[PDB]
Every structure is written in structure tokens, then in C-alpha cells.
Design a protein around this ligand. Structure first.
Ligand SMILES: [Cl-]
Ligand SMILES: [Cl-]
Ligand SMILES: [Cl-]
Ligand SMILES: [Cl-]
Ligand SMILES: [Mn+2]
Ligand SMILES: [Mn+2]
Ligand SMILES: [Mn+2]
Ligand SMILES: [Mn+2]
Lengths: 330, 330, 343, 343
């Protein structure tokens, strides 16, 4: 009577549905587990019985959603910079040197960005370096150079700010404040950025989890500033063929969990000039809101990322390949 | 006389170019370093002087190229399976269940693959599991099921082989032998796969470097079998939002270093059904030679990857989105 | 209401238990997995669903109920692994040529990375025997990143090892790389080593599980503790419980070392399993200057043993040239171990 | 030909050295970086190139020659970091309230994860003083993943710490999270802690480098040894050499622990630098059952100290509830440390 045994199992399956549903209604903390385990006469072990009931209690399950989550705001956040609506559906491109070395250097790149009809430029005035003996950046002087270039060539400036006291100072010179990977968990810097009315480009930490990245964005938004652009720039792994491992999957995860725009930095992730174009194409196809890459008039003598930055002729070929890819409406 | 000091530096720069070039010609092992360091009267430290000369000797610099490298064979390797030239420029798609559970299960998926005009199907007869108490696969019986399906629906079969003794046996049932991530460094298995005339789909190890992946492919090709398809399937990292981190940059690196086709497995990398489509689009745009994803008629009851496999209606929507993306000529 | 909810909880336990018993009876009256029967039960359950839960929630609860029943099967030890202290609380002692491993007194395994010749292995064996040690390691089959690097002498390497061991009274630990070589190895080795790269070569694990020979299982390059334990369970589920676990570093971003020695794995494994745990200080660090400190940490954290490489002339070694200690270095290392009072 | 090639090598050294001296004179006769002058020198060099090397190879050689010259600058210590044994061979001893740290006798730092009240910190201080210990840790500023988790009492937390320490005669170690708080902290702490998440907050490091106060620098979540040393150099290059390095585990794929304790970092750091090195066994493992074994490994590998968390009632702690030892657990832990003969 194997069919009769199965019949009874089926009947018990229905009985459990009834008991669970009847109970679920009425129930609408570890006191129950103690009593349940006291009545356990087998065949399961207490740990298993406990695990089953916890799952049943969990089933029984507001406005405690993070400000950066789609659960809080379903509509996409659009951050407009120098007329460009970052996050609207049309990708933006941010090119420029790794470090601001001189007015002439930055102007040369700006001229090449302007000629392509582009509107944004990046440049580091403050450079976080592994060693204190490497070029630390020009500081405030570099921001003044960027402002001059912005005024002359009509480009919106994105530049990294490294300490809370410099946030206020930066407001007069930049269009977007960048918080670098090494400072993604510099919480006081995040809070300072959250207290000003200026867009923030928040880079993912060297080894930050998605949850930590989201938390960091929340530090900023909880202070009042919701103009946050998230930037994937690779994560630290064992792989030596690349400087970092571009985590392309972060884009759709962030686009689904948050309402913030998401960019991809293809230079700092791969650390390889031969991977910029392929990685940019992947970023565009996966629907990133923008791509960032470094360009320098004479990379061989650059004070940072000498091998990773495209020179002007290389930037031209890269751009021409982007236009020919049909991945962009430009 | 600062200009005169610079003039002399410039003159010495030219003198060094002459000495280095004259020497380079004549020189066409650590004996030299000993003599050089003995004559060091400052200002540099021996370690620095040593480092400079090593770089100079290195400059002074065949057919020792790996069989899998473009240095050996510049032309792309094309692997034809059931009429499809994998590696020719047009991407291929490989769908199918994680495990072969029954003929009916596999046939249902095969019917859905055939209806879309596709020609390949994957299915695991041998399943490497973390625990010995999880479903290990049907074994040879599963291969016979796949062969039946291949004959009936006209699809080329890709299936994993887990031990050297099964390679010969597999030849009668599969069109492509798959070597799984956990066996990428099962060297005797690799050698066995290299001794047969059958395409091999080699998956990147859980934490394998690009160099190791290439080395593994070389184990196979050195035995005589050059019909190797490389497959990126994510690497192990600290990130918990995904099962693995899809290393999309591996595709262009492998396409540049080797002449072997390169596929991307979007299911085992992300481990998330909501990331399959976005990741597939990135793979196509970065010019992967193909994409692999899992489909099962009833994923909730699957004996492996229950949450990661698309059901038949979900497969239809995925495919329709791929067709609408304009990333494929299909 | 609480009073009534407590009654419903007891009724659920009785019904879950009764159902579980009935399903176990079906197992006897008869693959262990049956997806068709599971879908059949779900269809009936979901068709009878009248809320408050959605069909998706109901399905998840029941799948958990069904999943739980699998552990009742006598052949399934998922809830109390054979290698776990839940199965056997007492420490497993693995005896090799009279030497107990896992009894509380640490053992030391020294020897060359690769077997290169009789003379080479014999010189190391002599230095081991002089210290009163009883084990020797040596690779006859060498897993290499590139197929053009030295792969080992193979069977001839095992023969050299046996000859040297038989003369110097030492127990041999050597790596076997494929299932077919397990039977042959039985006549040449005292402990079969399964390398890091083969930790998830499941057919090899099963084959090692079918013989009565001590096995030294090395942790995979990036294996989790759970996976390492699972691999050991593949061996033991076949019948062979003579398993020694070996921590040998894990792959990380750090470039100062070859791998990152995960010292914490020792106490985790000694609490969770009853199997002895050793530490390989050569393959973890890949640095001669870290051998002694890491060996002391291993001993202090209560490892059951330490493994390290020694070669008469590391300069000419066909593997790990810079990592292996020469004979004088081995003497200094050992004297420090003796003076540490950790043994 | 070898005879003539050996002559050319000596001529190169003399010319490289003469050139280097001349370029250093230019530095005195005068930013340290000058990309325009570098391009100007390269243009002249490349224009004169007549083979055999291509312009790209020539450029690389010269860039290396120019790069080398940077280390001659008196302010550049890239070739012999101030924190390295190449700079100073002797061990740096950091004294805190009479207690030398780094002299050969290990120190122990216990205390709660977060400062919650006077009573809470005082109870822990009492248990520390009873053991004859002289240091206490406590977080007033708590770096948290989420802004909605307890951020610490701030200044009031530092005040509580000072009050308790002044009464129980203990030296205070507490985390400072932003450059502006460094000056204020001087009146409340004995050792300024820079947390893992701030290891590359360079402006904070520079500010800690400008004061005369011991600094406890924690290794970044995924920092390489090179980066950790570089961070310490940011501090010391400003003038403050009273730096204690703290290994606290690194981020890996392993889920059995919070982080992977990188025990090998201790001997690497003690060889490479002259700075004392401590190990935080609570934040590395994140597990109460691994505290004692990891502490023993740290002591055996010659760490200069060990840090661990103690809280009077971990159940109500606003951070690391499951990781902190209660008072009875602290007693058992300490008795084992004493019995180990490692101290
Ligand atoms: Cl840097
Ligand atoms: Cl699995
Ligand atoms: Cl190797
Ligand atoms: Cl936290
Ligand atoms: Mn850069
Ligand atoms: Mn699967
Ligand atoms: Mn070795
Ligand atoms: Mn804590």
C-alpha cells in the first residue's frame, strides 16, 4: 500500500497548510522554541525542529527604507551638471587627466573634450598616494586651474576632495565633488559632503561591499544632499593581470537597489590602456549612466598613472570607436 | 649659471645614449654587477645602481611561445559544433539545465531551444557538489539521455566530464566535453582531454589567475587537441551580493593573449536570475564568442541551482530581450 | 491568543513529525531525489491555498519541510557529518609507522618539494633521522601551473621514496594526482597526499575513501572551511576515516607572501571536526624567513603537526628553489623549535 | 669583447653618477616634480637616437635614470623609509604611562568596543586593574557601515574615558576619526587610534604626524603590507615616530570568520620596520571562541601586544555584542594566558 502512504502524506500536507494558515492569522519571542523543543519526541533533532519553526515564524512577515533605496523613492534621481542630466537614460562621458599638473596640460585635454562636443572634465588637485613621497597634488591651486579651464572651455569640473574642511572651499571651484575609493568610509568627509548643495561622485571602496557602498551613500543623503552619483571603479582581488577587477555586475545591482545614477571608471579598474575601449562598451551595454577615463597630453611624463592614461591621438581613436559602436546616441 | 648646469646634464644625457648604444651593439651573468658595485663612489646606493644596470641589461632583449598564444598562431581558432562556428565573430548561445534529472525535463528545455532556432544544449550528467550528500548526477545514464535528446532535437551537447577514465566514454555521447571550474587544475584530466579529437569547454577555476587559465589550456593543446573554448564564469571574492564576481575584463585579455574562443557563463558567475540579461548584454558588447545560461522546466524542484535557473516563460522573455537589444544578428 | 497559538505550535510539531515518519517509511517500502513527486505534492498544496500567504511563500515553507526530511535517510549525514564532532566527539588519532598523529604531541614532516634522485632524498632522510624524526615528504607527481615545468619522476619517484624510507625507517607522505594511481601508491606510501589543486577532484577523493590508508588532505587554494570539511566527508563517506587535514594558506590580494596563512583555520577545524590538523609553513608563506615564526604560531595554536621543505642544495631544485631550507638551515630551524618549549 | 664591455659599464656608472650629482646641484641652486623639463630632456635624447634601440626603449631607460635621481633629494626617503630598519636598525620603544611597548615584553589592551556609560567603562577598568594591567581601549567615535547605527558618544565618551583612566591609573587608547579632532584628543587620550577604515585617510595621518602623541595605526580592511608601511610613513614624515602598528585581519572570501587574521604580517612588519606590532584578536576573527588561540599564536610569533574586547554585559552592547568577553570570560581568558608561559 505505497499509494495509501502517499495519500496520507498528501492529507498531512493539506493539514499543515491549514494549521500554518490558521496560526498565521491569529499571530497578527524565543518563548515558543523552548516549549516546542520540550515536546519533541523525534524523529528530527531539536536544531532541525528549531530551524523549521524559525522559517515558519519568518513567513509571518513600513517606511524604514534607506533614503537612497528605490523602496523610498521609486523614480530615478537625475543629477544635472553643466546642462547634462546624468541618470536620464543617455550616458555621459567624463575624460581628463589623473592629476592636475599645470594649466597648459589641463587646457590641452579640455580642448580635445570640447572639440568632441563633450561637457565634463575630471582632474585631481588632491591625489591620495600610497607613498607620501609621490606627487600629492597642487591642492587649492589645482582647483583654481580647473575653475579657469571650466570658465574658458565651458566644461563642468569633477575633482576629488580629501578632507571635510575642504568641502566648503571646493564649492567655489568645482561642479561635482568626488569622494575617492580610499575615503569611501571616511565618514566625517561623507557627512560634510551631505551638508552642502553640490553633486557628489562617490567612488566604491577598494574592497567595499555593495551594502557598504550603499551605506556610504546613505551617510551623505541623510544629511540632506540627495545629488549622489555612484561610481564603480573595480575591486581588489588576487588577479595580477589587472590593477583591480572591474565588477560590472555592480551596475545593475545598484540600479535596482538604489535610485542613484551609476557610472563606471574604466581606467582605475583595469589599469590597462588596452582594456579601456572593451570595458567602456560593456559599461554602456549594461546601461551605466556614464563612463570615466583618463586622458593626458603626455602620459609618459605624468606624475601619476603614466601607463594608464590615453594621450590625445589615442583619445581620438577611442572616441571614434565609441561613436562607431552604436551603443551611444552621440 | 643654472642654464649651464642644465646644458651639461643635456650633454651627459647624450653621452649616456652613446655609451648605452655602443655597449648594446657589442653585447650581441651577475659577474658585471659585482665589478660595477665595487667601483661605486656614490651618490647612489648599491641597490639603486644594481637596479639601474639590471634595467639596462634587460633592454638588450624565438619560438618558445605557448601553443595557445597568438604569438604561436595569429589567426583565430574556430570550433564548429553541430554546424556553428564558435569563434568566427557571430556569438553563440548555450542554454540548458544545471543537472540532467530526466529525459522529460531535458526534452522540455530542448524543445524551447529548438523553437528559437538555436543549436546547442548544456546539461550536467556528473555534478561536482560541495557535499557528498547532494545530487551527484545520473552519470553515464545522463549522457545517454543527452545523446537521445541530441538525436531527436538536432542539438549539439555540452556536458561536464569529471575524471580521465570518462573522457573516452564521453566521446560517444557528447559534442563538447566540459571541464568544470573545480577541475581546471586536475592536470591528468586536462591531459586526457588533450589526447582526444573532441572540442573542450574549459572553465576558469574558482580563483584561477589568467596565467593559470592559459596554462591549463596549454596542458590540453600540448597533447595535440587545439579545439579549446575558454569560459569565464566568475571569480571568488569577498562580495556576498553575488555568488562570484563576473570578471568581464578576462574576455578581451584572453582574446588578445590567446587565439581561442571565449565564452561567458552568466548563471554561475552572478548566481542571480535578475542579473542574467544585463550580464549577457555586457558579454555580447565586449565581444565574447558566446554566452551560457541555465534553463529548467521547473526550477523550484531542481536538484541544483534552484533559484538561478530560468523557467521556460522566463527564457522566452530573456531571449526576446536579447533579440531586441540589437547586440546580436539573430 | 498566545495560549491558542502555543497549542497550534504543538499540533504542527506532531503533524510535521508524523508526516516525516510516514515519508521515511515510504523510503523503506521502496534515487533518493524525486523532483516529480515534489512538484506533485506542491500542486496539491498550492491548489488548496486560501491565504493569508501567497503561493510563493507557501511553496518556500513546504520546500523547507521536504528538505528537512532528507536528513532522516540513514545514508545522509548532512546534519551530523561523519568527520564532525557531532558524529564522533573523540579525537581521531592517525598512526603512521607507530607515530600517532592527533594525540596531543605535534609531529613534524620534512622533505624536498620534488623527488629528484636517490642521493638527494637520502641526504634529507639522513638529516631527519639524526633528529629522531619519523616522517618524510617528497613529491613524485608535481602539479605545475605550466605543462613545460618539471612534472615529477612519477612511479620512479615513489620507488626512490620507498627505498630511502625502508632504509632510514621513515614513513612516506607523497601526493597522488589521479584515481587510477591510488591502488599503485598503496605499496609505496604511508600517507597519500591530496594536493590543494585537487581538493575538489571528487572522484580522487572517493577513490582515497575506498582504501585503508592514511590521507593528508590539503585545503584548496581558495576553499572555504565548509568546502574543506565537505571534501574530507567525501573520503570518509566511502569508509576511510584516517584523514589528516592540512592548512597551507589561502589565495588573497597580498603580494608579500605567496599565500596568506589562515592560522584561525586550525582551531575552527579542531572544534568542528575530530580530525587532526597540520600546517604547511612552506607553501603558505613561500618565504624562508617566515618558516620559523609561522611554525611557532602553528604549535602555539595547537596544530597537530607542521610540514616544511628541506633540500640538500636548493639552488638546483626543480621546484621551490628559494623556499626550501638547506641542511644547515634545517639544523638551525630545528634547534629553535626544540628551544621554544612549544613541543 | 667582454673586456671592452666591462670598461663601458664603469664609464656608465661614472656618467650616471656625475649626471646625478649635477642634477642634485640644480635642486639646491633653485615643486620637486617637473614634467616639462623631463619632456624637454627626452626630446633631445630621442632626436639623437640612431639605434640599435627603438625610441620607446630609450625613453624607458632614461625615465628609470630620472626616477632614480628623486631618492637623492633629502626630503625623499623612498629608498629607506623613516619607519624602516634601513633608516633605523634599533627597535622603536613606545612608552605609555610608564609601560614600554616594543621592548620584548608583550602588552595587553582590553576594553569595550564602545563607551556607553561611566559605570560600564569603570567595571571593565576595575577588572583590568585587578590583573595588574595598565591600558584600556574604548571607542567614543565609532565608524559604522550604516549612519543609523550607534556612532559613539563623541567628546563625552572621551571625557568618560579620561575620568575612569585617571582614577584606575590606566592609559587610554581611543579612535580619532577626523583631523580637526586630533588637537582636542590630546587632553583625553594616551594613544590615538586610527581605525582600519581610515588607514588611507591621508590628511588624518598627516595631522597625527604633527603632534607628539603615540599613535596606534590599524591595517586597512584590504591594505597590502606596502600600503600599511606607507601609511605609517605619512605619520612619521611629519615628525611623530611614536607609532604602533596593529594587525586586525584582512578581508577575504571566508565566511567562518569576520576577517582572516594575517598572522604572517607580524614577522614581516617586525623585520621590515622598527615599529612595534600588535594584534587585535577580536576584530580579526569576530569570534569569542577564537580569541584565546589567536592570542597565543600572536604571542608565539613575537607580537609586541594583543588587543581584545571586554564588556560587563555584552548582551546589551551597542556594538560587537557576540564578540566581546564578559567579566567572568575575561578572567578565564587571562588565566589561560598566564598559564601558557608565552608571557
Ligand atoms: Cl599611488
Ligand atoms: Cl554545490
Ligand atoms: Cl607552481
Ligand atoms: Cl559594523
Ligand atoms: Mn588616475
Ligand atoms: Mn548550474
Ligand atoms: Mn614545495
Ligand atoms: Mn569592537
Amino acid at each position: 500500500n505505497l499509494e495509501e502512504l502517499r495519500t496520507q502524506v498528501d492529507q498531512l500536507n493539506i493539514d499543515l497548510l491549514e494549521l500554518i494558515s490558521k496560526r498565521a492569522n491569529l499571530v497578527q519571542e524565543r518563548e515558543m522554541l523552548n516549549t516546542i523543543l520540550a515536546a519533541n519526541e523525534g524523529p528530527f533533532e531539536d536544531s532541525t525542529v528549531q530551524k523549521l519553526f524559525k522559517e515558519i515564524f519568518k513567513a509571518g512577515l513600513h517606511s524604514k527604507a534607506l533614503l537612497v533605496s528605490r523602496k523610498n523613492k521609486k523614480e530615478d534621481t537625475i543629477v544635472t551638471v553643466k546642462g547634462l542630466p546624468i541618470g536620464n537614460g543617455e550616458p555621459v562621458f567624463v575624460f581628463g587627466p589623473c592629476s592636475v599638473e599645470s594649466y597648459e596640460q589641463v587646457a590641452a585635454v579640455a580642448e580635445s573634450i570640447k572639440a568632441k562636443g563633450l561637457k565634463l572634465i575630471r582632474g585631481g588637485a588632491f591625489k591620495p598616494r600610497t607613498s607620501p613621497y609621490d606627487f600629492q597634488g597642487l591642492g587649492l591651486e589645482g582647483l583654481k586651474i580647473l575653475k579657469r579651464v571650466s570658465d574658458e572651455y565651458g566644461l563642468g569640473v569633477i575633482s576629488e576632495i580629501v578632507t571635510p574642511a575642504d568641502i566648503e572651499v571646493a564649492l567655489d571651484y568645482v561642479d561635482v565633488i568626488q569622494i575617492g575609493a580610499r575615503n569611501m568610509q571616511n565618514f566625517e568627509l561623507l557627512k560634510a559632503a551631505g551638508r552642502v548643495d553640490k553633486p557628489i561622485l562617490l567612488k566604491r571602496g577598494l574592497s567595499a561591499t555593495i551594502e557598504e557602498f550603499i551605506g556610504a551613500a546613505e551617510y551623505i543623503m541623510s544629511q540632506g544632499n540627495g545629488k549622489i552619483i555612484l561610481c564603480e571603479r573595480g575591486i581588489r582581488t588576487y588577479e595580477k593581470a589587472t590593477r583591480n577587477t572591474l565588477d560590472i555586475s555592480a551596475v545593475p545591482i545598484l540600479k535596482k537597489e538604489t535610485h542613484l545614477p551609476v557610472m563606471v571608471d574604466v581606467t582605475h579598474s583595469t589599469g590597462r590602456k588596452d582594456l579601456l575601449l572593451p570595458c567602456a562598451k560593456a559599461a554602456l551595454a549594461i546601461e551605466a549612466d556614464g563612463v570615466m577615463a583618463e586622458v593626458h597630453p603626455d602620459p609618459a611624463v605624468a606624475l601619476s598613472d603614466s601607463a594608464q592614461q590615453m594621450d590625445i591621438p589615442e583619445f581620438e581613436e577611442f572616441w571614434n570607436a565609441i561613436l562607431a559602436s552604436n551603443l551611444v546616441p552621440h
